[model samples]
Every structure is written in C-alpha cells, then in structure tokens.
Target: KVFERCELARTLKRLGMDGYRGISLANWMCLAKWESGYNTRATNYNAGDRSTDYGIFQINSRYWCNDGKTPGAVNACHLACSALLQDNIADAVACAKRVVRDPQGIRAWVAWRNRCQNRDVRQYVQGCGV
Candidate 1:
C-alpha cells in the first residue's frame, strides 16, 4: 500500500497544480480511499463510459494511456511505462508537475486546495512560490 500510495503521490505531484505540494501523503491516501480504494483496477461505474481509469492513481487510460499528447502513446505497455516513469509513479503526476511549474489553468494551487475539504480531506492551502 505504501508503494502504491507513493506512486499516487508522484502522480499528484505531476499534475503541476500548486495544491499538489500542499497535499501530504496523508491527503493522497485519503484521495485513494475514496477514488479507487487504492485498487489499480478500480473504475468509475458512474463515468457513463467504460473509461480506462485504473491503477493506484486511477487515471483514465484515455488521458494518458494512448495519447501522444500525454507523453506516452496510448498502448498499454507504453501507458504502463508512462505510469512507472521515474521511480514507478503514474505519468499524470509528471504531467501535473510540469503544469504546476508553469501554472496555466487554475493558476494558484492554494485556490485549488481551498476546493478540497472533508471528513477525509485536510486542506493545506498556500501560495505557489514556484
């Protein structure tokens, strides 16, 4: 679970949103608790489509699975490779990390952090000095 959680953490980091840095391991664990129950094979039955949401990170395969825009092609092998990129984490985290560095959409991470608060989620809002 720790290894999977670590992978999830890296995926969140790659989102590149400022809130990611504020998000602690505990926070990510909470996300997994609700998102996929930490199951890599988890999928959203509510998604209305048979989306490719899988892994500890539960990233849709369409987002980063076969699309070149996602850095790795949509092939399963490549997707897995992308997920395992740099210390065996999902590529979404890497992608997010890149976005966070630039901050195009949702410019401030703190703002995004403010959006998350719950019995499970602990909010950690702060300015993105980066």
Candidate 2:
C-alpha cells in the first residue's frame, strides 16, 4: 500500500513520531520516502547473502525479522518479515522505534544517514497539522 504524503504524516504523528522517541516527523517522513516511497510491500533482496530488507522502513531480515529461510536470524523484532509488508503499519512503527532506541539511533537506517541527517526536512510535514 502507498500512502499520500499528508496521510503518512498524520499516521506517523498518531504513532507518536511527531517528536517522541527522538524521531521528528520530518526526519521519519524523509527516511520513509527514500527507503520505500511509502509503499508497504516494498522489499529489497541482497544478492550476496540472500538477506532481505522488508516493508516501508526496510527493516532487515538479518536482525529485525525472520524471513524463514534465513538461517540463524536474529529476529529482534520477533516478527515475520511478512508482517512488515502489511497495510496496517502499527507493527512496522513499533519495530522502527526499537531500531531507533538502539545505540545507532535512527542512523541504523542508511537512508536517514545519506539523505535526511542534519538536513532540515520540515517540508516533509509542512501542512500535516500534526
């Protein structure tokens, strides 16, 4: 599922990312844009190791979710990778918050580092009224 920009902002705000959990709505919106273009079913497969990144946040199978076929998976989020691909994003948001709380902070997402870090992303939430 793909969300309109404002819709996504509203949803993220409802999920408590409007500044809670140290994640600003702008930053998370920007991160989501680059990571999956707000598409819930997005997935990227690693050719080398066959690990995959799943869902809008692109949570990795190596540590965050169980892809079933990935041996010795960490399953830190204790969820199946498929769960991240659903239209209901509550699970994805919860797992992403856990990722943010880790030592790496939101930098756990390379898209955030490469595109959103230190940049003013206020435009992402410009008129959301969140």
Candidate 3:
C-alpha cells in the first residue's frame, strides 16, 4: 500500500503522530517518505544480522519485532514482523511510536538524519487539506 503523501500525513496525525515524542508530523511524514515511500509492504533484509526491516517505517526485527530468527533480540514491541507488512498501518504505527520513546528519539533512522534533517520538511505536510 503506497499512500499518497498528504493522506499518509493525515493518517499519521490521526494516529497521534503529530508532536509524538516531541517530533512533528512533518518529520514523521518525511521519515516515512524516505524510509518506504509510504509503502506498507516494503522490506529490507539485513544479511549480517539475518533480520529484516518491515513496513513503511521499516521497523526492524532485531529490536522492535519478533521474527523468530533474529539473535538476541529483546522483541521490544512484542509484535510479529509479518504484521508490519499489512496494508492497514495500525500496527506499524504503534511500533514506530514505540521507537521514538527510546533514547535515540527520532534519530534512530539513518535516512532521517541524512535526508529529512536540516531540510525544509514543512513541504511534507503541505497541501491535501492536512
């Protein structure tokens, strides 16, 4: 499920992403845009850890989710990796929310710092009545 930019921003807002953990909706929108293009089925396998990043936010199996394969994972979110792939983003949103509460804050993602950071992120939440 590849979501339209503003639609996804609205959805994340409804899901309480706006100002979530001190992060703005635009930052979240930017994060999702570069992370997965709002595509729920997006996945990237990490060969060294043998874990995978799942969903639009790319929640990782090595920490956030339990994939029954990642070694020494705390399974922090207590969710299965497969759930993140669903078109309905409820679970993915939950997991992503959980990630921000960590010490890393929104800096957990490399794409975020290297891409959305220090840019005109306001453009992400513009238009579409969001």
Candidate 4:
C-alpha cells in the first residue's frame, strides 16, 4: 500500500516512534520516502554484491532478514524478508525497532544517512499534525 506522507507520520507516531532515540518523525518519514517512496513491496537487489534490501525501510537481507537465498544471512530479525513486504508493516516496524536498538541506530538506513541525516527534516511532517 502506498502511504501519503502525513499518514505515514501519523502511523509512526502511533507506533511510538515519533521521537525514538532522538530521531524525529520527519527524519523517519524522509527515510521511507527516499528508500521506497512508501511502497511496502519495494525490494532492491544489488547484483554487484548479491545483496537485497527489502520493504519500505529497505532492511537488508545481510543481517536483518533471511531471503533463504542469501548465503550466511544472519537473519537477526528471525523472519523471512518477504514478511516485510506486506502492507500492514507490523513485522517491518518490529524489525526496524530492533535495528534502531543496534549501535548504528537510524544510521542503519542508508537513505537516512545520505539524505535525512544532519538536515532539518521538520518540514517533512509540517502541517501533518502528528
């Protein structure tokens, strides 16, 4: 399901992630926009390294989820990567929380690092009333 930016902001807030680990809701929304454009089924395969990033957050198969095809996949979330492709995003959110708890925090998302980080993202959620 494609989410409107405001809807995503509200949903993230409902999930208690609005200010998670000092990361703002706008930053999270910005990351989602850049990573998947709010497409939950989005998946990107990197042939150069044989790695795949899955779902809206683009969680990588290398450590977060198991595609069952990636060798040595740690499957840290202990779930199939395809589970993240669903529209509900319950599993995706759960796994994302795990990722945030890691030492890298939100930096685990390259989209955040490349675009959202160190930028004033307040406008991303402006007028959303979240």
Candidate 5:
C-alpha cells in the first residue's frame, strides 16, 4: 500500500514508532518516504549481493530476514523476507525495531542517513495528529 504522508505518520504513531531506539516518528516517516514511499509491496533486488529489500521499510534479506538465497546471510529478525512484503506492517515494524537495536540505530538504512539524518524532518509528522 502506498500511504499518504499523514496517514503513514499517524499509523506509525499508533504502532509506537514515535521514539523507538532514539529515532523519532518523523525520522521513520522520512525513511519510509525515501525507501519505499510507504509501499508495502516494494521490492528491490541487488544483483551485486544477490539480496533483496522487501516491504514498506525495505528490510534486507541478507541481514534482517531470510529469503533462502542470500549468501552468508544472517536473519537477525528471524523472519521470512516475504513477511516484510505484506500489507500488514506488524512484522516489518517488528523487524525495523530489531534493526535499530543495533549500534547503528537508524543508520542501518542508508536512506535514513542520506535523506533523513540531521535534516528538519518535522514536516513529515506535522499536522498528522501523531
């Protein structure tokens, strides 16, 4: 699903993404905007590493989820990559939570660093009732 900006903001708020791992909801929204445009079915395959990014949060098959094909992969989320592609973002959110638990925090997603980090991301959640 491609979520409207505020729609995604409010949804993430309810999901308790507001301040998970010292990352605010706006930052998460910014990450989602750049990564998948809030699209749950979005998938990008990386031939360089033979891994795929799946779902709204674009969790990686090589590190976060298992797709049964990534070389030397570690499924830290202990979930199937397919689960990240579902419309229900619960699994993706859970996996995302697990991702930030690492020392990298939100920096695990380069998109976040390049696009959301150190930027005024307040607009992402502004007027969203989050």
Candidate 6:
C-alpha cells in the first residue's frame, strides 16, 4: 500500500499541480485506506450489480478485462481502457488531472457535495479541500 501510494504520488507529481498535486495524493490515500483497506483485490458487495471492481484502485474487473456485456458492464471496460491498460500510474494521474481540470479543484467537489447535501462523506470532501 505504501509503495502504491508513493508510486501514485510520483505519478501525480508528474501530472498534477498546485492543490491537485497535494490533494490528490492525500485524497487517494484516504480513499484507498477506506475503500479497500489497501487490498489490491478488494471489492464492494453492493457496488452495482457486478463485483468487477479490482486492484488498489478498485477498478471494476469488467472495465479492466471484460466487455460491456459482463456483469460489471461497460463502466468497467471504459475505466480499464482509460486507466489500467494505459498503466496504473498514468491512469490515476490522468484521472486526477481531469478532476482538477473539469471541476477545477477540491472546491468544486465540495460545491457538488453541498448540492447533494449529504453529511456522511463531508469529511472526505473537506479533507480534500473540496
């Protein structure tokens, strides 16, 4: 887990910037800690109809290794094409870059959180500065 986080941090360093650089690493670390407890094979029982999510990032298996017809569906395939196949580090950094670029920052995430008005995950959003 530590190694993966370090690798991800390095990837983010190359692809991210400013707050994205710092926040993404922190956010991902936190997410990994919670989502899978750093387990590479961890998966959510109720994460949609498919138990396809895999790896430290919990990328859906269908996305990484299957087509849309699989239990995990097309989401997994799309994610795999975008992230895992491209390379884990590259995929993560690219995702972070897009997040920062599209929403603009943690602030955007926070704003979206406000719209949802949920309090349970507020800490996650706030900790990321969104």
Q: Which candidate should be chosen as best, given lDDT against the real structure?
A: 5
Q: Please give, for residues 1-130, the per-residue lDDT of candidate 5 as tens digits.
A: 7889998888888889999877899999999999998999999999999999999988889899999999999999999998998888888999999999999999989998899888889988888888
lDDT of 6 at 111: 32
- Per-candidate TM vs. native? 0.41, 0.96, 0.96, 0.94, 0.96, 0.43
Which of the two, 1 or 2, has more TM-score?
Answer: 2
Q: lDDT for model 1, on a 0 to 1 scale?
A: 0.43
Better of 4 and 5 by TM-score: 5
Residue 52 of candidate 5: its Cα lDDT? Answer: 96
* Over 4 Å off, model 6: 1-7, 21-24, 37-48, 60-72, 76-87, 96-130
Candidate 6 colliding pairs, count: 7
Q: Write model 4 residue lDDT over 4-123, tens digit each, in one string.
A: 889888988898888788878888898899999998999999886677999989999989999877777688899899899999887998898889999999998777988888877898
**Which candidate do you rate higher for TM-score, 4 or 6?**
4
Clash count for each candidate, listed in order shown: 13, 0, 0, 0, 0, 7
lDDT of each: 0.43, 0.90, 0.90, 0.88, 0.91, 0.44
Rank all candidate structures by their lDDT, best first, as comma-separated numbers: 5, 3, 2, 4, 6, 1
On the 0 to 100 scale, the lDDT of residue 20 in model 2 is 60
lDDT of 2 at 79: 93
Clashing pairs in 6: 52-61, 53-60, 54-59, 63-76, 63-77, 106-130, 110-130
Q: Which stretches of candidate 4 lie over 4 Å from their true place?
A: none
Q: Give the TM-score of candidate 1.
A: 0.41
Error of 2 at 123 (Å): 0.6
